[PDB]
A paper describes a structure:
Arthrobacter nitroguajacolicus Rü61a 1-H-3-hydroxy-4-oxoquinaldine 2,4-dioxygenase (HOD) and Pseudomonas putida 33/1 1-H-3-hydroxy-4-oxoquinoline 2,4-dioxygenase (QDO) were the first dioxygenases discovered to belong to the ABH-fold family. Atypical for oxygenases, these enzymes promote the activation of the triplet ground-state O2 molecule without the aid of metal centers or external organic co-factors.
However, in contrast with what was observed for the HODH251A–MQO complex, following O2-pressurization (40 bar O2 for 2 minutes) Fourier difference maps revealed a strong elongated peak at the R-site of one of the two HODS101A chains in the asymmetric unit. Modelling of this peak as an O2 molecule did not result in negative difference density, and occupancy refinement converged to unity with atomic displacement parameters for both oxygen atoms consistent with those of the surrounding atoms (average B-value MQO = 21.3 Å2, B-value O2(O1) = 20.5 Å2 and B-value O2(O2) = 19.7 Å2). Using the fully occupied O2 molecule as a reference, we find that dioxygen binds underneath the A-ring of MQO approximately parallel to its plane at an average distance of 3.2 Å. The ligand's atoms closest to O2(O2) and O2(O1) are C2 at 3.1 Å and C4 at 3.4 Å, respectively, and dioxygen further interacts with the main chain amide groups of W36 and H102 as well as with the side chain of the latter residue.
Numbering used by the authors:
A (entry chain BBB), B (entry chain AAA): 3 to 275
Write the structure that this text describes.
Amino acid sequence: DTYLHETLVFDNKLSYIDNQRDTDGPAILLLPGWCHDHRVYKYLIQELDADFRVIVPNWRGHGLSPSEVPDFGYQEQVKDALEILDQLGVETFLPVSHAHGGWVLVELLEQAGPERAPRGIIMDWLMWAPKPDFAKSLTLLKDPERWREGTHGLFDVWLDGHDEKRVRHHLLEEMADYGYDCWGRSGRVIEDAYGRNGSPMQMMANLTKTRPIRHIFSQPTEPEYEKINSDFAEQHPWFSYAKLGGPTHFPAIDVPDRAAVHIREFATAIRQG
Amino acid sequence: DTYLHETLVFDNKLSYIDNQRDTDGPAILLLPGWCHDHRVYKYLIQELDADFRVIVPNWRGHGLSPSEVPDFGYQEQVKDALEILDQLGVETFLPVSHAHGGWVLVELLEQAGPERAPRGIIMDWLMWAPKPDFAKSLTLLKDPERWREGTHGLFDVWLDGHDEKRVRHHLLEEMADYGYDCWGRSGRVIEDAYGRNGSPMQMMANLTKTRPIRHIFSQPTEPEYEKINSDFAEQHPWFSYAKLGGPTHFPAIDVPDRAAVHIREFATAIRQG
Ligand SMILES: Cc1cc(=O)c2ccccc2[nH]1
Ligand SMILES: Cc1cc(=O)c2ccccc2[nH]1
Ligand code: NA
């Protein structure tokens, strides 16, 4: 929280982490998903603080004081992220997303191009089109009468029967101040993203300039899900994955050391040409 | 449609009008706005055909067969337009834009400089930051559930209670094949353009090399809008305007003779040193 800043981004005052580390590029851009903020990355920032410049933008209506804002999508998140990087004078960066931060990361690869964003790490991001249970969850979040029932079902899936203190603290304390305006929006945007782009996999395959992307995930834990990642990886030389074997949907929190080594590896690859 | 061509522009096959008129410069570059094409200029091309070389580039995913393309902005439109001018071996040109074609025209003045692009004509282009009605329209266009409602509200404003046959034909027939991918994009880019640059007026004032620019418009029709143009013109010797008193947002269609004389005047000024 030493590193927490505010700046005007077009019409919106956005909070963002920036450790202002004077070191060789690329900068690490940690991308929150929906209805949480930089706090998800507090442990991963500890892993990276000393060796890298670390930037964590918070979305419109996101941060330590969540607020009602006009409707926006992953395109707006991309412009917001770049506008912060333009203000900070950051050129080359390695974007790292959690879950539906991924929609922002892939579009940011498309819009920034392969000189500015040569690689991407996507963390715990449902690679297939929505299964019935997840589809239902999106429907609940959009429902003004059942949005909290939506979050409760998703919390259950994300903790996956683990009494994981740090991740429980994130869901129940650090995301407590987020209301229907955010959760409803997340349901609409993610449902729309899947409907329009088909899947994260279809979207990455569809990039104008394919680049090295790694998916590091703990869940879903079933072999069928490992197989779709293995099947995509076999088909696409630029695509790789690592199953982190962490307890929850939030490897940034519950295996921050493991998330860090994959990021350092990609950051190192970028420095080596 | 004698003059309709196709060419590879970086990664995209773009259609463009070129009458290949062998005459003295400058070439007249008619710039379409968002989610229409060269058809908007069919009557203005008739006015200019005999006396000038006339070039009308169509944007990525724009033309007689609209298509889904990766997200691009006014910067990409500028590079596309220049790449076509480079391929055609056109040196000096007079750019003429309709509505949010203007973002392309002003950036094209910046990038081409005052030797290559000594003047610009901007047609019916909202000079002020978005008013509530237009802001709402941008919000609707971006909405995948209400984008068509967005276009319908804009059609209403643009026809302004006129049974204008040619302009009705343009909106309802010649723009009929344009879907959410374009209209959604137009909303995001125009909202971004205003948010980034403030207004067309702020953007023109901010040019590295200020040059003669005329705004010719029919709407908005209210004296307050004439005043902001009069106020900008008083402040900037290079800036002028003419109220065309055409029924609609499309003076290229409903007063093509009037658009033509202002273009000829500027083209003549350029030939006279
Ligand atoms: C923080 C976070 C993680 C998720 O997987 C998610 C999924 C749907 C909606 C909102 C979401 N928010
Ligand atoms: C043809 C055309 C004129 C406009 O004033 C406009 C405004 C917003 C979006 C798209 C647009 N398209
Ligand atoms: Na591979």
